[PDB]
Structure 1
Amino acid sequence: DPNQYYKIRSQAIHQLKVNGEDPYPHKFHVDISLTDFIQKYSHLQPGDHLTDITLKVAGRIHAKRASGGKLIFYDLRGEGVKLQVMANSRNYKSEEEFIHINNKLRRGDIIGVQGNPGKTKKGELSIIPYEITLLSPCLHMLPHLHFGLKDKETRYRQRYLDLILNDFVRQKFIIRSKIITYIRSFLDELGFLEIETPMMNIIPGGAVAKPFITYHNELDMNLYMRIAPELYHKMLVVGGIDRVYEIGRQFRNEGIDLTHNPEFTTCEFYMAYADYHDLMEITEKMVSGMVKHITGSYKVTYHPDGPEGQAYDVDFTPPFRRINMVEELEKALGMKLPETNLFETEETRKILDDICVAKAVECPPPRTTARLLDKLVGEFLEVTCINPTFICDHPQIMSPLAKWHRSKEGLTERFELFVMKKEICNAYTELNDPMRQRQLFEEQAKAKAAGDDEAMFIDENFCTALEYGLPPTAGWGMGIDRVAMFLTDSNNIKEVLLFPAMKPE
C-alpha cells in the first residue's frame, strides 16, 4: 500500500512535470514565518476575516480534511507550530483553480499559501487563501503520530521523519545548541581563545582509548583520528597563549551503549596560572549557570531508566558536593587500601584484585591496578553521585598527565564531575615537569608492551615542548553529549545525536 502509494504519486507528479505545472518551483516569496503569523493575529475574534491584509506563508501539510465540495481544511506546520488553512471556494482565485489545486494536494506536501488572516467561529486562527502553490510534494505515505514512529531504530535511521512527527526531538537539539553557545559565551568572556587543533595525528594522545586508523595519501603514512586535543592545547600554552578552548569531535574506537558513541563532542579548555581548585569553582559557576539559564531553575527532572522507570529531580544548586576518591572508597569498602604510586607493584595489584573478587566487582583483562581501582570506584562511589558531585584526588597511577598532589603522596590534583552516576567533566592541574612526564610515559609504554592496549604512546614531541617551560596550568574537559542528555531527559546518547551511527539495516 505505501509501496503502491509511492508508485501512484510519483506517476502523478511526473504527469505534472509533463503538463508544465512545475511541481518543484524555484522560488516562493514567504512574507512571514508561521510563528510570527500566530503571534501577530492570535488577538483576532472568532469569525474575523482581515480582507485587506494579504500574506504569504509556507510549510508542510500534516492533515487534509474536506467539508462538502467547496471547503477544505489543511493543517499547515513549520517551526514547531501549526496554522490552519481554511480554503473556501468563494475566496479562492477561481472555482476551477480551487478544484484543481485541491485535487492535486496530499498530506505531506510542502505548500505556499497566499491569503488573509482570519479566525473560525470555533476560535481557530486561520489563513484564508487566495492562492495555494505546491512547492514540493511528498511521494510517500507520511506516517502519523498515532501509528508511528516510536520505533527507535527508524527514528535514528530516518531522523527527518522523527523531526517532522515529534516536536520534542527538535526541542532536544535546540537545547543541545544552547548548551554549546552558552559555553562559548562563558569562555569568551573570560578571555579564552577558541582554537582548532589537528584531528589527525601521528600519535593519538590525551586520553585512554582505542584509536581509529586511516591512510593519508599525500604523506603516504597511516594517521590516527584524535582521541583528545589535550597535548596540542598545552603546547599552545607553552607558546604563550594563556587561555585556550576547543569544542570539537573526538573519536574513540570502542563500544557503543547508552552513554558511548565512537564520535562525540567535547569541550576542553586550558588556563595558565590556574589549579584544580580554580577549575572546580569555574565548573560550578558554568554548569549551575547553564542549567538555570536553559531550564529556568537549578533543578532538572531526569529518568535514568527511561519513562518506564522512576524519575528524580537533579539539583544543580551550587556548591557541589566534594568527595576524595581513596578516602570515600575506603569508607564504602569498610577497609583500608594499599598505597600506590607511579610504578605498578604486584603486591598492591594483588590486594586490589582480591578486593574486587570479594566484592564481586568485575574487571576484564588486563586487571591492572588502575583498572581495578576504576571498577571499584564505579561500583561504590559513582553510583552515589546523583546530584553533581566532584570526585577528587585520583591516584597517580590512574592519571599519567595529571600533576602530583602538593600535599597528598601518591595522589594527583584531579577531579571528575559526576551527574546521575555518569562523569560529565574531567580536569586536573597539569603535569608540567618534563622529566616526570617522560617517566610516566615510559611506564605507560612498558604497560603497553606488557598487554595494556589502551595505554598511552610516548609523545616525544610534547615532552620537548614541556622542556621549554609550561607555566603552572590547569585543564578541563566536558562531554557535551552527556550534558545534553541530562538537560533533555534522555538516557540514550542517540537522542542527542542528529544522525547516530547505526549497524547496517
Structure 2
Amino acid sequence: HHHMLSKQLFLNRCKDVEEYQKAGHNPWPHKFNVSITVPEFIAKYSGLEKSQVSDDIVSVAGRVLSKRSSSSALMFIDLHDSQTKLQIMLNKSAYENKEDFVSLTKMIYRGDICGFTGHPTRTKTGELSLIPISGMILSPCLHMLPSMHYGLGDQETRFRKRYLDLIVNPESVKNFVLRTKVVKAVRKYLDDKGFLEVETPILNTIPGGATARPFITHHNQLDIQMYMRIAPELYLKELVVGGINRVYEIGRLFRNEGIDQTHNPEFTTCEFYMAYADYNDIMKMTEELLGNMVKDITGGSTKLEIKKKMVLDFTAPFKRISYVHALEEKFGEKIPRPLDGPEALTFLKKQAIRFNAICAEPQTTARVMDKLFGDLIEVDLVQPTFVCDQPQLMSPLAKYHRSEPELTERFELFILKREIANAYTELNNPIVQRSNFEQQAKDKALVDEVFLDAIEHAFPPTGGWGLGIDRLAMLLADVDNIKEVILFPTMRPEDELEKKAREAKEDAMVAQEKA
C-alpha cells in the first residue's frame, strides 16, 4: 500500500481546507497588503530593546515553518520571507477578534502562507517579533514539507523539486542571486562602453560547421528542417559588417550531447564583438570586468575558496603564458620548426612517453600536443591566467599571429584548471575564411554562404570574446556541480521504479514520526 500515509494526509488536508471554507473563511484571499518585508522589518525595528513594544502598525506575510505554543492563549510562529525569519507572537489578549483567534490558531498548518498585522516588539527572551491584532491564511499547504534541512546531497530529489529545495535549503538561493549579479556586471560593463545588446536567431536552416551535435526540429508551414544554435558568432559578426561596431549577446545555446556535472543540454554564454580591437585589448577588458565582479562580492580583488581554505587572486594583471613556450619551458628545450611537420611529431612523441605516460590515437600532432599540454601544464593553472598564441595546428578558424610564425592571435583564460573565457583577433580575410569553411565541411563529412557574402563585403578588424556564464557562476559560488547554478537543470524522467521507491521512503519518514 505504497505511499498510503501521504495520500491520507493530502486527503484530510483538503478536508480541513473545505471545512475551513464552509465555516466562512476564504483559504485563498485575493489581496493582502504587505506594508513591510521582514528584512526591512529587521532593519527598521532591530533597535528595539527587550519587552519594548512599538506603537507602529505594520503588516507582514510569509511561510510558516514553525508553529509551537506554550499555551492556548500564546502561540509562536516562525514566519519566513526572503530567506529571513520573523517570529509571530500570537497573544490572545492582544488579538482584536477573539473568535477568529481560536479558529485561525487551530487551522494554521506548517507550510501555510500567512499574513499578520500588528506591533513590532522584542520579547524578554530577545527575539524580535510581531504581535498581531489580526491575521489570516493566505494560502494553505496541502502536503508535509520536509524537515530543515533535507536532501544533502541526494542531488536527485533536490533538482527534481527545485521549489522544495529552495524552501528547505534557503542557502541555495544565495547562488542564484550571485548568478544574476554576474550577468548585470557584464551587461553594465559592456553597455557603458557603447555595446548594443542584441538578439539573434536560435533557430537556423543551416546546421553549422562545428562538429558539435545539434538539436533538430521542424517548421511546419515552411516544411523545412531547422537547427538550434551552437553559437551566435556569425550573426553578430554580420552585425559588425553592417555598421554596428560593438555588439553583444547573452544567450542560450544548445548541445545535443551528454549530461554531466559540467554539462547541461542548454547553457548560457556571453559573446561580444568589438571593431578595431585586438585580443590584448580584450585581455585587459577581461581583467577589468572579472575584477569588478570579485570586488563586488568581497570589497577586495582576492577571493577565498575551498581547498578548508585557499585564495584566488583576481588582482590585475593576470599572469599570461605562451602555449608552445610553456610546453618548451617544461620539456627542456624547443620543438622542431614546422610544428605540423614529421620531425616535430616524432619529437613530441618522445616527450609523450618521457613525461605524460599517457596519450591517445589517432596520433595527429594536434592531439598529442593537446594531451601533452593537457596533463603537463593545463593541470595545474589554478590562479587566473591567460594562455596565448596557440598554434595554427590547434586553431583552424583563427587569424595568424602578426610577428611570430605558426602561431595565432587568441587566448584562453584558465582558472582552477578550467577554461572560463576566450578571445580572438578575429579572422577577417574572406578568401581564407571561405577555404576554412569548405575544409571544415569536408572534414565533417551545406556551408553558410550568407555569412561568407557578408564578410566578402569587408569585415572590419574586430576583437571577439566569449564567456561561460554557468561555469563562471560555478566558480564564484564555489560549487563543483553545474546544476547548483541552474534553476531547473535537465532531468532524466524518473520511471516507476525510483518513483515508487521515492514515495515509499517519503512515507517511511512519516512512519518514523508516528511510531
TM-score, length-normalised on structure 2? Answer: 0.90
Conservation of the 8 A alpha-carbon contact between 2:390 and 2:410: yes
Alignment match, 1:383: 379
The alignment status of 1:42 with 2:40, answered yes or no, reads no
1:89-128 matched pairs, under 5 angstroms: 89-128=92-131
Structure 1: 5+ residue runs without aligned partners?
A: 304-308, 450-456
Alpha-carbon shift at residue 47 of structure 1 (Å) = 0.5
SS at match of 2:408: coil
Alignment match, 1:454: none
Alignment match, 2:16: 12
Alpha-carbon shift at residue 119 of structure 1 (Å) = 1.3
Partner Cα separation in structure 2 for residue 65 and residue 180 of structure 1: 42
Change (3 A) 1:475 1:18: same
Partner Cα separation in structure 2 for residue 179 and residue 67 of structure 1: 46
Alignment match, 1:326: 324
SS at match of 1:250: strand
Letter in 2 for 1:53: D
Q: Which of 441, 458, 461 is the aligned partner of 1:472? A: 461
The alignment status of 1:411 with 2:407, answered yes or no, reads yes
Alignment match, 2:431: 435
1:257-276 matched pairs, under 5 angstroms: 257-276=260-279
The alignment status of 1:298 with 2:301, answered yes or no, reads yes
Alignment match, 1:26: 30
Q: Which of 269, 282, 285 is the aligned partner of 2:285? A: 282
1:62-81 matched pairs, under 5 angstroms: 62-81=65-84
Partner Cα separation in structure 2 for residue 191 and residue 207 of structure 1: 30
Alignment match, 1:453: none
Alpha-carbon shift at residue 96 of structure 1 (Å) = 2.6
Partner Cα separation in structure 1 for residue 346 and residue 485 of structure 2: 41
Partner Cα separation in structure 1 for residue 492 and residue 330 of structure 2: 40
SS at match of 1:288: helix
Alignment match, 2:440: 444
For the aligned residue pairs, the C-alpha RMSD in angstroms reads: 2.2
Aligned length: 489
SS at match of 1:59: strand
Conservation of the 8 A alpha-carbon contact between 2:302 and 2:313: yes
Alignment match, 1:158: 161
The alignment status of 1:252 with 2:251, answered yes or no, reads no
Deviates more, 1:213-222 or 1:81-90: 213-222
Change (3 A) 1:411 1:208: farther
The alignment status of 1:361 with 2:358, answered yes or no, reads yes
Partner Cα separation in structure 1 for residue 444 and residue 12 of structure 2: 62
Conservation of the 8 A alpha-carbon contact between 2:303 and 2:313: yes
TM-score, length-normalised on structure 1? Answer: 0.91
Partner Cα separation in structure 1 for residue 237 and residue 487 of structure 2: 31
Partner Cα separation in structure 1 for residue 72 and residue 219 of structure 2: 65
Alignment match, 2:176: 173
SS at match of 1:260: coil
Alpha-carbon shift at residue 330 of structure 1 (Å) = 2.8
The alignment status of 1:187 with 2:190, answered yes or no, reads yes
1:343-354 matched pairs, under 5 angstroms: none
Alignment match, 1:315: 313
Alignment match, 2:509: none
Partner Cα separation in structure 1 for residue 243 and residue 65 of structure 2: 57
Partner Cα separation in structure 1 for residue 233 and residue 268 of structure 2: 14
Alpha-carbon shift at residue 442 of structure 1 (Å) = 2.5
Partner Cα separation in structure 2 for residue 88 and residue 336 of structure 1: 82
Partner Cα separation in structure 2 for residue 202 and residue 337 of structure 1: 44
Conservation of the 8 A alpha-carbon contact between 1:211 and 1:226: yes
Alpha-carbon shift at residue 473 of structure 1 (Å) = 0.8
Partner Cα separation in structure 2 for residue 368 and residue 488 of structure 1: 38
Alignment match, 2:500: none
Alpha-carbon shift at residue 32 of structure 1 (Å) = 1.2
Change (3 A) 1:177 1:144: same
Change (3 A) 1:89 1:496: same
Conservation of the 8 A alpha-carbon contact between 2:291 and 2:314: yes
SS at match of 2:9: helix
Alignment match, 2:421: 425
Paired-residue identity, %: 54
Change (3 A) 1:285 1:485: same
Conservation of the 8 A alpha-carbon contact between 1:195 and 1:244: yes
The alignment status of 1:88 with 2:84, answered yes or no, reads no
SS at match of 1:398: coil
Conservation of the 8 A alpha-carbon contact between 1:117 and 1:127: yes
Alpha-carbon shift at residue 296 of structure 1 (Å) = 2.1
Partner Cα separation in structure 1 for residue 318 and residue 211 of structure 2: 27
Q: Which of 389, 395, 400 is the aligned partner of 2:391? A: 395
Partner Cα separation in structure 1 for residue 474 and residue 58 of structure 2: 40
Cα deviation, 1:153-201, whole Å, max 9, x if unaligned, reads 1111111111112232111111110110011100011111101111111
Alpha-carbon shift at residue 345 of structure 1 (Å) = 6.8
Q: Which of 441, 451, 472 is the aligned partner of 1:462? A: 451
Change (3 A) 1:371 1:468: same
Structure 2: 5+ residue runs without aligned partners?
A: 495-515
Alpha-carbon shift at residue 340 of structure 1 (Å) = 5.5
Deviates more, 1:166-175 or 1:490-499: 166-175
Conservation of the 8 A alpha-carbon contact between 1:384 and 1:421: yes
Letter in 2 for 1:41: Y
Partner Cα separation in structure 1 for residue 269 and residue 437 of structure 2: 24
Conservation of the 8 A alpha-carbon contact between 1:205 and 1:228: no
Partner Cα separation in structure 1 for residue 336 and residue 349 of structure 2: 12
